[PDB]
Design a protein around this ligand. Structure first.
Ligand SMILES: [Cu+2]
Length: 125
C-alpha cells in the first residue's frame, strides 16, 4: 500500500542553509512524498533530465504543502527553485538500484549540490 514520507523545507538545518530534511527519500511505486513549508520561501521542482523515464515533470507553488506521488522506478533529483545554487535539493529513490542514479551523479550541477547528493548516497549505502 502507498506510504508517505514527510520532507521539511527549511532556511537552515543539519547540512547548513537552504535544505530539505530529509534530503534522501526511499520509496516504492505509489508512495507519496509530502513537502512541508516549515519556513517560508521554498518550493519543490523536478530537475531537468534528473527524473526517471516516464515520470512527469513537476513544480510546486512557493509555500505550498505539496504531496507528490511517485510511481516510476528510478531516482529523482528535486530542487527548490530559488535555492538550487545554495544546495537545496533532495534525492528520491524509487525501488532498488535506481537505474538513472549514476547518470544523475555525473550530471552537471553545482558543487554544493554535488556534495549534498554524494553525502546522502553514502549515508544510504
Ligand atoms: Cu528554498
Amino acid at each position: 500500500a502507498s506510504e508517505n514520507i514527510e520532507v521539511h523545507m527549511l532556511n537552515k538545518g543539519a547540512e547548513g542553509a537552504m535544505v530539505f530534511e530529509p534530503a534522501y527519500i526511499k520509496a516504492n511505486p505509489g508512495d507519496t512524498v509530502t513537502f512541508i513549508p516549515v519556513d517560508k520561501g521554498h518550493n519543490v521542482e523536478s530537475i531537468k533530465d534528473m527524473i526517471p523515464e516516464g515520470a512527469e515533470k513537476f513544480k510546486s507553488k512557493i509555500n505550498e504543502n505539496y504531496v507528490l506521488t511517485v510511481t516510476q522506478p528510478g531516482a529523482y533529483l528535486v530542487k527548490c527553485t530559488p535555492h538550487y545554487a545554495m544546495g537545496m535539493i533532495a534525492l528520491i529513490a524509487v525501488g532498488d538500484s535506481p537505474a538513472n542514479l549514476d547518470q544523475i551523479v555525473s550530471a552537471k550541477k553545482p558543487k554544493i549540490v554535488q556534495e549534498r547528493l554524494e553525502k546522502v548516497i553514502a549515508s544510504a549505502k
